[PDB]
Amino acid sequence: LGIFPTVEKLVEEMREQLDEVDSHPRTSIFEKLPSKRDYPDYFKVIEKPMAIDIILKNCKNGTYKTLEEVRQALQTMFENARFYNEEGSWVYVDADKLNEFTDEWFKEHS
DSSP: OOHHHHHHHHHHHHHTOBOTTTOOBTTGGGSSOOOTTTOTTHHHHOSSOOOHHHHHHHTSSSSOOSHHHHHHHHHHHHHHHHHHSOTTSHHHHHHHHHHHHHHHHHHTTO
């Protein structure tokens, strides 16, 4: 099937994970990186900024060739949000719930 299409389908499932009260997709804060001009402090903290759009592109330019590399990239994406955002805040909650889902997804595939 190829790494990119498999990941593309992973991302689609991820986008259907919805918060239970307001139904917002837990992927929402993870879709793209914040703009560096408007959020310069974020990029002095976060060593490896990571978002969903970069993950998909890295699955078709040779950067990620295995699902384990993809899961590792998702891990630092989640770690950055947990590091940056207060425990119990909605961004932190979305990271935990979305990570739980991707973790279960990687077991059912390899």
